[model samples]
Target: AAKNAFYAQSGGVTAVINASAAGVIEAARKQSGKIGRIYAGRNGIIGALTEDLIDTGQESDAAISALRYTPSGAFGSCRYKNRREYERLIEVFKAHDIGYFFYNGGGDSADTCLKVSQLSGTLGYPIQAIHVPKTVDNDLPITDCCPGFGSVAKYIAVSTLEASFDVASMSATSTKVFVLEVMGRHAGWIAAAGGLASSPEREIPVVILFPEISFDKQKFLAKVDSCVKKFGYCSVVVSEGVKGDDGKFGGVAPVVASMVKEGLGLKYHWGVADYLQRAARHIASKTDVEQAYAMGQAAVEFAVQGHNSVMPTIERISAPYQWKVGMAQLSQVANVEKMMPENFITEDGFGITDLCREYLAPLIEGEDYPPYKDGLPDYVRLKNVAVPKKLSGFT
Candidate 1:
């Protein structure tokens, strides 16, 4: 009998995440004789524990296909996890005879998948678990880059470039500084994307701060001072994860705004792109969409090739980026973070290096536009038909 395959999306959702979901479902259907129906957790792993799985088989092919262009988790997601939670997952899997598990998310989800695989021997349940890469932070190790990052990088890079144009035009008498704060806590990948906003012909004055580097208040003000004085205005692309010398998390944009006013004595404006940065699917990178879907597709394909505790990886360089579908054991990925290479970040730690641009530029290289309806993206919506329960009240 085809093992009941369980799928779930966890943690922060992103633009091309559902594309990966589509990849897993579509690939599984191709092997219909061997893989049974896909049962998605209604809200991440909580669904598995609560026995609230969505019968993806109930959704029409058209609906499944529509997921390819959808942004965010099609089912739902949550932020709860622990050893006890892993036990609940085993109980749920046993109740439904689920042998294959596909979890899509970032580092935390990878850790969860790794723990579930332990149950194969610890609890006598043989579950084949695979971690599907889907983080905008792009901090997950083993893979070249996480799935959701490309679109995010593209979005921030474009935003900094466009907004800088506006700031420059009005700089003679108006705002002299523009600060845009993006996501990314431990890694500087998303922050690095903002650095992409600059180039030779453009000659835009851009400053960056990553969590990977220590925040130097005076140095930052000096850089901003130079940019505004020389170019008539400046833009600061900062990561929310950047820490103060006091080892605390304070306001990045507003802090920079104050820094600009005090140090450079310049007028400033700022914006924090929290959800908007990760949720912009209409401008998702074609590279991101393709790789996101590929990760999803590869997760299912590699998992069934008699492999357990594994994740599909992207193995290649940027465009002409002729790639290969690679695989890595969950042990190698779980809880491990890949920080920006020293060469990728400038020695001063305020911007990306040329080598960094070579790597990031391709990710946000192309555009994969979603269908539009009255001036808005025509994203997908599923019925999410529930799977009949097999157990009593969940703990």
Candidate 2:
């Protein structure tokens, strides 16, 4: 009488996402009497759409165990929206008799989970769907923070700290401006996290460009000039989703490119961390990985308990950084996006406020080192699993 479960990774991948997958698989295995075989979608929703599923039950224990510390997308994630492909999902779910669905990704993935819940109910399919949130953006609502955000936050903070030292060494001569572009297209949480590296004695003149605020080229240049003149060097941490004063996506690279041509010539170097921020397992927060795995396990537990239309969530317990895992109805978290609050940003939109620092500091507290071999962490690689087809041609 064990119930079968389906798990998929959607949207962008995170360093510890497979940790979440591993958590779900192990949790389900613990309840062998209630949970049957676990199936994973080969390439996110595309796998579900094409009826391409992997039977996790076939993988060896060592392969499954190794997933705990792996980086990148183990199941091959995707960014496809669910609204455009809900029908195909229903067909696949029905065909496989999958009773539980666990999805790991960001806001779009949450939205997809919502659609699956609604469609399953409408079609009278008794499937319990739970979202295991994983985004470096940390913009998902109702949860204290997302799984992937913590590790990325740790990376940004540590990277900025290191970069600050590098810039300090060259302050007297060349390489005065260092611009690092962090992730978070719609939220500044990741960018703001960089502020944790700053202090009074060795203050690095750091400026942040949030998506919530409109970008001003002249204003930014003026600020940069002021930082260079006042502090002898300038280090900027900008969000990828920064919007211009004209309401368009503002990237510092274009501004820097323009300035180089405008005769205010200065030597500078910029880095776009983009996907690298989310895939860095080397500097992952042990807290983040533990929470990520806990949420995954919670999703399976919720499904086994016959709870449908819910996403496993984390609740903040204390102000100075304490959290406990819990469940939030999918109706509350699904499809709803949380942006960085106004109070979290500084009054002038140049950096994060003390309030924001307090909120984000704890999430990236501790480090979890991976096993290193040949100068790189030895990562897990899961063997392919092919599920037996139960139904004929349903697309």
Candidate 3:
């Protein structure tokens, strides 16, 4: 008999994550005969543990297609952890006869998938678990780049460029230093995107502070001081992962103000891209959307083909950004963190190098905008019909 499959998106969602969901659902539907109905956890794996599943079969084809343009986790997400949680997930998988598990998330999600495979195998469930990579941070290893990163990188780059122009116009009387704090905890990939704001064509002065490099107070101040002196106004892009002298991901916001105003008295401004960076589906990268969907589709393909404990990875083959999906074992990918490469960072540690630009360029090359109606994007909301529970109280 064809067995059911479990699919869930976990961790922080991206502008194109639902594209991945669309990939999974569509691919599974194509294999309707071999794979039973696709079931999604209402809020990630928690839905499974609680026996609260959503029968994705209830969703109309249009609804599933709209997921490609949707931002965030269409199936809901959770950061839920701990051993007990894993046990409950296995219990639910067994009860539902879910022989295939597809987890779409970052490193922790990979760990969860790996754990499920281990426990399920030990219990003789014969479940095929595959991880569908998704992370805005772009820190997961094995894959060339994570799914959600390109869009955020695009957002940060554009945001930095626009804000610099805004500050540049009023540098004479207004803030001379503009700080744009971007997300990318413990990794500097997104922070590096800020460098894209400073191109030879436009020639905007930009300084970047990466988490991989120790924050140098006098040096950073000096860099900003130089930019202000040379260009009349300067833009500073700071990563949330940046560590201060206290060895913490210190708020560079205060530091930016105090230093810029210290004796120099250069008025300054700061902004955190925060959720805005991740939620800007209006301007998502075409490459990212394509890759996200491809990964999702590949997961279902991998499962049906008897591939177990594996993930579909993006393999960047050549210069002009040709890519294909490759397989990675869950053991190799789980718990691995890929930090920004040294070659990617400039020698002064305040910017990205040319090598880094080449690597990031292709990822953010094209745009994939959502359909708009009445001056707004017409995104979808799934019906999320519940799957009837087969077991007694999980408690």
Candidate 4:
């Protein structure tokens, strides 16, 4: 019999996350002989536990089609984890008979998927759990990079280039410093991506801070001053994860506020692109979205082929920037986290090294523009999927 399938979006949602959802829905339809009606959790596993799953079949094709280019979590999302709520998950899965589980999120979510995989057998249920990776941090292991990273990288690079232009125009008196704070709590992948905006020889004088390095107040201010004095103005891209010597994020607001209190007496403006970096689909990466969708589709296919406890991954081709989709056992990708290479970090750690550039250059290659109306890009709003009752609720 065609089995019931469940798809849920967990942790932080991405710009093209719905593209991955669309992939699973469309791909499962092709295996109609083996796949049954698709159900999506209303707000991730909480919805599943509460018997609040959306019937994908109930949605209009137009709504489903719109997800490909849509940003954010089309089905809604949650940061809740199953480890802390394992009993709730067991009850939900048993009621729904969710033989095929597709979870979309980052490292923490991947760990959640791994737990569900192990629990399925313990509960005497036959469930195929798969992870559809999507994190701007690009901290997940075994894959070349996470799904949402490319678009974030693309946004950072383009923003740096455009901001550099603005800074150049106002170089005479005001706006001598432009500071941009980007996502990434531990790894500096997204921050490093901004380096792509700089050319090899004739690079703009930009300062970058990665969380991998210990932050020094004196060193950072000195670098910023040097850049401004040398170039008449400076553009800085700082990662939100950039830690102080005490190991804390050196956000633009706090850092700049401190600098002012310390009486550095430098004129500067700053941007905190916290949620904006992840949510900006207006400048998403086509390559990232395509790969995200491919991984989701691959997960369904892998399940149908009787695979379990694995994640669909992107294998980097030998070529400089080429990549292809493949699968890695959950044992490899789950629970295990990958940090930026030591070589990618400089001794001071305020900037990316040559090795970091090579890893990030490929991700920000192509841009995917969203449909626009009245000068701004249009984002689609999906009709909520109604939950169908199958069994008595638990927890």
Candidate 5:
């Protein structure tokens, strides 16, 4: 008999995450002869530990296909992890005869997957564990970019543009500064996307505060003052991770906005694109959806090929805009973070250079809109019927 598979989503959810989920399920189905029914954990690994799994076989083909356009975690998600958890995962895997594991998330998820793989061996269970890349942070190593990042980047870029337009029109008398905060606790990729708003064809006064750069209040105020003086308005995109000279990571947008008022004596407005940036799938990038699905499909393909403790990756082609499915060992990927390259940021440290633009432009190039109903996105909700209990509850 073929070994069954287990799939779960961990950490923060994102716009194209379900697309990856769909990819895994659909691809696994193609290898039905080699893989048995694929089960998904409810709220991630907790489901496995609790013996609560959703049978992907129970979902209709249409429902499974609909996941391609859905946002967020279709099978729920969690951020919990521990050594005991990994041991529990082995027991659950043994009970369900689950030999293939596909974990979808960011850096932390990669570590969890690696730990599970290690423990499974010591615990006497042979399992092929694969980590599926999915994070808006774009901080995970060995992959050109994570699956969930592109769409979120596109959202931030677009939001910055539209908001800038409004600020520009009101600047002469009203708000001269618009500060928008985006995710990226240690990486500034999403905040860098805001630079996409200003291009050669259309110059918008956009000041981006990356996490990699130390926050200099006086310097930032001067930059904002210059932009407002020249362009009549300015937009500031600050990453949540932006730290002070002493490594103080505060609520960046409000602090930046206050500085604009206190230092430049300018009127300011601010917003945090916290969940909205990552959850806006109605305007997800075609490239991101494709890559997300590809990563998921590739993960299963690797499992079917008897690969263990590995992750499916995106290999960037030298061409201006191209990528191919790649693979990396979990040993290299787990717990490692790839920070923004120095060349990607402009010399002033407030914007992205052309090199960065070239890399990001392709990610948010094409639009993949979800179907709509009554002027609302027609997203799917899977009938996550639980699998019957095979073992006693886990504490």
Candidate 6:
């Protein structure tokens, strides 16, 4: 008898996460002799704990395929769960005879994946849980880049370029500085991407503030002032996790914009990318969508191949940009974050270096637009039919 599998999306969702979900379900369907019904948690692991599973087998093949273009978590996502939740998870898995577990998420969820896999020993339940990498922060270690990051990078780079052009046009009288805030709580990968707006062919005067670099008010203001003086207009890209000399999380978009207003006394416009950056599947990167799905598909493959406590990694093949799936042990991946190297940042600390450009240029290179309907993207909404419960609801 084939063992059933349970899949769930955890932590912050992304534009290409559903594509990973598609990969998991589609790949599992192809291995019917080895794997049984595929179940997804209603809201991450909470669904599994409560036995509120969605029967992916009920979804049509086309619906699963459409997940490749869908944005956000098609089965929903959750942020909090701990030991008790893990125990309940094993209970549910045992009841459902779930031998294969696929967790699609980032660092934190990787930790969860490892713990659940360990339940095979602690709780004496035989289970294989594979971590499917997905983070817009691009902070997961081992994998060259996480799945959700490329699409967000593409969106940020394009937004920075287009907004810089708007500020440039208005520099003569209106706004001389535009401040755009991007996500990156600990890593500066997303913030560094804004520098992509400035290229050899078309240079846009842009300043970037990274979390790795402490906020120096004097130096930052001077940089903005110099850019405005040189280019007539400037764009400032600040990460949310940027810290001040006091080591506090300061220098958010509005705070930095305030400095430009008071220190440089330049009229400025500001905006926070927030969810907009991670949810823009309409302009998702082709590389990101493909990699996201590959991770999910590979997770299933690794599980059926008798591999456990591991994750599928993306191996960069370099230039012209080719990549293939590799495997990494979950021990090295869980709770580990990959930060931007010193070489990736310019000496001035307001731009990305050539090496960083070389690495990022390919991730955001190709566009993978979603299908459209009446001028809007046509994303799928899964039926998410519930499976019959065999256990009491979790309290």
Q: Which ten residues in a row have the lowest lDDT in candidate 5?
A: 81-90
**Candidate 6, after superposition: displacement of residue 285 in Å?**
0.3
Question: What value does the lDDT take at residue 2 in candidate 3?
Answer: 27
Tens-digit lDDT track of model 3 for 163-224: 99899999998889888888888899999989987876778888888888988878988888
Q: What's the C-alpha lDDT at position 92 in model 2? A: 75
Q: Considering summed lDDT, which 10 consecutive residues are worst modelled in model 1?
A: 316-325
Segments in model 5 whose C-alpha atoms lie over 4 Å from true places: 82-84
Residue ranges of candidate 6 with Cα displaced over 4 Å: 82-84, 249-251
User: Candidate 4, which segments miss by more than 4 Å at Cα?
Assistant: 82-88, 249-251, 257-264
Candidate 6 lDDT at 138 equals 97
TM-score of each: 0.97, 0.93, 0.96, 0.93, 0.98, 0.98
lDDT for each residue of candidate 2 in 158-260, tens digit (9 for 90 to 100):
9888887888688787777777888887888889988888866667788777778888777777777788789877777888777775665546655653553
Give the better candidate number (2 or 5) by TM-score. 5
- Across 324-389, the per-residue lDDT of candidate 5 in tens digits comes to 999999999988889999999988899999999988988998999888999999999999988898
Model 3 stretches astray by more than 4 angstroms: 82-87, 249-251
Provide C-alpha RMSD values for all models, in order: 1.5, 2.3, 1.5, 2.3, 1.3, 1.3
List of clashing residue pairs for candidate 2: none
Q: Lowest-lDDT window of 10 residues in candidate 2?
A: 256-265
For all candidates, what are the clash counts?
Answer: 0, 0, 0, 0, 0, 0
- CA lDDT, every model vs. true structure: 0.87, 0.81, 0.88, 0.81, 0.91, 0.91
Better structure of 1 and 2 per lDDT? 1
Residues 1-395, candidate 6: write the lDDT tens digits: 32999999999999999999999999999998789889999999878887899999999988899998989999999995456777787778888888998999999999888888776567777888899999999999999999999999999999999999999999998999999999998999999889899999998998999999988998998998889889999999999999988876434778889989998889999999899999999989998999999999999999999999999999998687899999999999877789999999989898999999999999997888888899988889999999999887787
